[PDB]
Amino acid sequence: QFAKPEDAVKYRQSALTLMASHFGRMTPVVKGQAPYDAVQIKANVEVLKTLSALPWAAFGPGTEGGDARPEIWSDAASFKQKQQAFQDNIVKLSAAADAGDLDKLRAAFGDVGASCKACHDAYRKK
Amino acid sequence: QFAKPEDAVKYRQSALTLMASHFGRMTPVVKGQAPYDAVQIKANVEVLKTLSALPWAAFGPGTEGGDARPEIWSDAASFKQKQQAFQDNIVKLSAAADAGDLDKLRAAFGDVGASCKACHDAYRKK
Numbered sequence: 001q002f003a004k005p006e007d008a009v010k011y012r013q014s015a016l017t018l019m020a021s022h023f024g025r026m027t028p029v030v031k032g033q034a035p036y037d038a039v040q041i042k043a044n045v046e047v048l049k050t051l052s053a054l055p056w057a058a059f060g061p062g063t064e065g066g067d068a069r070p071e072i073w074s075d076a077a078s079f080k081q082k083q084q085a086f087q088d089n090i091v092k093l094s095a096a097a098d099a100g101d102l103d104k105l106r107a108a109f110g111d112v113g114a115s116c117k118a119c120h121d122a123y124r125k126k
Numbered sequence: 127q128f129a130k131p132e133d134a135v136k137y138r139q140s141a142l143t144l145m146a147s148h149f150g151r152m153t154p155v156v157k158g159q160a161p162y163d164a165v166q167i168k169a170n171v172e173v174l175k176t177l178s179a180l181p182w183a184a185f186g187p188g189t190e191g192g193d194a195r196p197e198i199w200s201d202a203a204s205f206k207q208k209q210q211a212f213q214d215n216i217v218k219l220s221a222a223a224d225a226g227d228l229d230k231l232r233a234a235f236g237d238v239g240a241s242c243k244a245c246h247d248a249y250r251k252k
């Protein structure tokens with residue numbers, strides 16, 4: 001759906017921005033600094049699920065640009081494992097949210113955050 | 127979820143960018159320049175449904191900025207009608223896509239596009 005690599009870059013940066021917001025807005029809840037409303041969190045994590053599937057198709061071949069490292073494309077299988085593992089970390093968060101289980105939500109939230117970092121440390125430029 | 131108005135601006139611009147892509151990528155399909163795969167379009171319109179609910183909460187009071195016109199905030203009811211009407215235009219597109227009805231998809235796609243414009247002409251700066 002991208003006319004130029006710049007369009008893929010703009011899309012993925014937008015998608016990732018929306019993920020940072022839907023993930024990060026739960027930090028006060030997991031820390032107990034804001035109240036835990038199970039219905040609210042379930043709905044927010046469903047948005048995050050949808051968004052978390054979107055960036056990867058905007059790293060197609062030849063879409064070097066932005067802050068993406070070239071290693072994304074020299075080993076396609078490894079990058080794919082990264083994004084699939086991340087999306088499965090999101091599945092754990094979804095399951096926690098759907099169960100209304102604050103303790104599982106905390107644990108899954110931490111693991112999701114680690115997975116964001118695991119990808120950045122291999123694949124995102126400084 | 128926004129520390130500063132600039133964060134709300136960045137969020138809504140990102141959300142609207144993702145809408146332009148999930149809407150606009152169907153143009154070749156509705157024109158017949160690309161094949162119509164009902165399953166594919168159903169899934170894409172579900173993404174567009176999710177995204178099309180997101181921008182509006184990032185125009186909270188005091189979040190002037192970007193290319194948003196001030197009229198968004200001097201008549202809250204009128205802006206709300208705009209975004210609600212748009213989301214109901216998206217409902218028609220969802221119903222068409224879920225039915226696998228290409229003729230209804232074409233018609234709804236045109237009406238959605240008109241609704242994007244109706245809002246821009248009142249509420250988006252040049």
Ligand code: HEC
Pocket residue numbers: 009012013014016017019020023065066067068069079082083086112113115116117119120123124125
């Ligand atoms: C690899 C599988 C990634 C995972 C998992 C996550 N992110 Fe990431 N992110 C990745 C890359 C390669 C890039 C650079 C994209 C480019 O072309 O520039 C990024 C970028 C971001 C950004 C900045 C977006 C922007 O506005 O330019 C943010 C805010 C971001 N990423 C956040 C983020 C969070 C919170 C994640 C887990 C919930 C996450 N990313 C996962 C690669 C990958």
Ligand code: HEC
Pocket residue numbers: 135138139140142143145146149191192193194195205208209212238239241242243245246249250251
């Ligand atoms: C009002 C109810 C709107 C509807 C419906 C749509 N859009 Fe719009 N859009 C609106 C505003 C007020 C703004 C400016 C936001 C800001 O603070 O700058 C926009 C902006 C866009 C953009 C640019 C985003 C960016 O990267 O800065 C795009 C690409 C865009 N809008 C597309 C778009 C499409 C395709 C729509 C219908 C499917 C649509 N918008 C509806 C207000 C409103």
